[PDB]
Write a protein that binds this ligand. Structure first.
Ligand SMILES: CC(C)(Nc1ccccc1)C(=O)Nc1cccc(-c2csc(C(=N)N)c2)c1
Ligand SMILES: CC(C)(Nc1ccccc1)C(=O)Nc1cccc(-c2csc(C(=N)N)c2)c1
Ligand SMILES: [Mg+2]
Ligand SMILES: [Mg+2]
Ligand SMILES: [Mg+2]
Ligand SMILES: [Mg+2]
Ligand SMILES: [Mg+2]
Ligand SMILES: [Mg+2]
Lengths: 5, 236, 236, 5
């Protein structure tokens, strides 16, 4: 999964 | 409000204690109680709210993905019917996830966003609104899926418009918003080219503004810049 | 019983799904529902029950330790009074922990232990009874602390007596029971010499019986034997 | 903490 903050 | 009898300051204190104990459900309940006192939230308090619910919904999302994967395999050609149990339990987790998202969205709508006038608060809350509609979108399949996606897009877009007018390109809230809106494009809106463009332009504009920053601000901004690069590497 | 309307087999299936999703509170609720169907549990089902509650109470114990440590520091000479909040929140977690322990002990008393006639089931359940009284002992401070400790000791001792008569020294249940009873001696009963003796004798008697085992049984037994050695290294 | 199972 891609990075999110 | 089960937290209605607790002092606001005690709720904030206990949210911090719950964080140290990795009790994120408790942390979220404490911070919901603090929001429901009706006062605006400080910067630290906003981040306690977001950390709490991000951890709770993050666990739910991880569980939902495991169960969805098991469910799809049970539906492949050649699988032995296991009955309704996998679907039922995926639905149970899904409903609990939707409930957490609705709770967060409810706090933003009553009345965090409408009282948020400074860019740092308003952009933060609108980013959250986009994020929690995005999590709803991840599990949506019905008559409302397009509307959920558009609600996420609309919140992110208002946040983006404010952030471009009112914050520098290295502002960590602005960077994190762009990171997540880029993921929205890639994973939700089936717009990988928009996702890649947004991540690249955000990274480059931030790079050019790093020279204005202190060492500590530089560390904060470059951390999120590295996440943008990580995603670009994943996608290209 | 909120699980009263669900099929026993569906509860077991969903416990396994919850495990895969790392949803251990759900897993524990499913397995409590299965126990409350009133039928004895198979070996696999007993281990689903234990895995579920061990993970739930393990998280509570970790949180309690964090909060207890913060509380003791707030009580040291030179600390700025923070108010009742740390104590209150430690008490909240403590009460939830005690509730989980009472739930497990209740399942063992109604009526898992009384129907358990085979060594592998009876020793397993009595080990659990010792374990959950041990967790109660870890947080106990009142008129009942000595009685809680003695309840743990008594359950472990009955389990030990059965295991020595009915199982080989490499049996993994017997090994795990001895491991945990040794920790009871060291950490709860202030009997480190008993703890060390029990771990060493258990290890040595198991070593001498490994030659009787298949490769797979050997792997199971030596895994727990390594934990005994690890503890002995910690203690000597 | 010591090991238990
Ligand atoms: C960038 C990141 C990872 N996420 C984020 C999420 C939504 C919108 C924008 C950014 C984040 O964390 N930024 C941050 C910045 C300043 C203070 C605190 C903070 C104060 S208190 C506290 C705590 N965990 N006790 C953390 C946290
Ligand atoms: C040794 C250990 C770590 N603990 C233990 C706890 C209390 C008393 C005795 C030992 C354990 O795990 N022994 C074990 C042995 C056989 C089957 C299963 C098992 C069947 S199903 C399943 C699952 N997690 N789905 C696990 C588990
Ligand atoms: Mg007040
Ligand atoms: Mg649904
Ligand atoms: Mg644009
Ligand atoms: Mg039936
Ligand atoms: Mg108490
Ligand atoms: Mg003895």
């Amino acid at each position: 999964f891609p990075a999110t903050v | 409000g089960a937290m209605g009898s607790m002092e606001r300051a005690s709720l904030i204190q206990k949210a911090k204690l719950a964080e140290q104990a990795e009790r994120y459900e408790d942390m979220a309940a404490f911070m919901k109680g603090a929001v429901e006192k009706g006062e605006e939230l400080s910067c630290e308090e906003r981040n306690l709210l977001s950390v709490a619910y991000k951890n709770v919904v993050g666990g739910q999302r991880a569980a939902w993905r495991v169960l969805s994967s098991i469910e799809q395999k049970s539906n492949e050609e050649g699988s032995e019917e296991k009955g309704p149990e996998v679907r039922e339990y995926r639905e149970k987790v899904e409903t609990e996830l939707q409930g957490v998202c609705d709770t967060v969205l409810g706090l933003l709508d009553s009345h965090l966003i409408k009282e948020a006038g400074d860019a740092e608060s308003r952009v933060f809350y609108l980013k959250m609104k986009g994020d929690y509609y995005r999590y709803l979108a991840e599990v949506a399949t019905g008559d409302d899926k397009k509307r959920i996606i558009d609600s996420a897009r609309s919140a992110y877009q208002e946040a983006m418009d404010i952030s471009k007018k009112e914050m520098p390109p290295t502002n960590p809230i602005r960077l994190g918003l762009a990171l997540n809106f880029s993921v929205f494009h890639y994973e939700i809106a089936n717009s990988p080219e928009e996702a890649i463009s947004l991540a690249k332009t955000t990274f480059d504009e931030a790079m050019a503004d790093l020279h204005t920053l202190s060492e500590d601000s530089y560390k904060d901004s470059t951390l999120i810049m590295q996440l943008l690069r990580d995603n670009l590497t994943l996608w290209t």
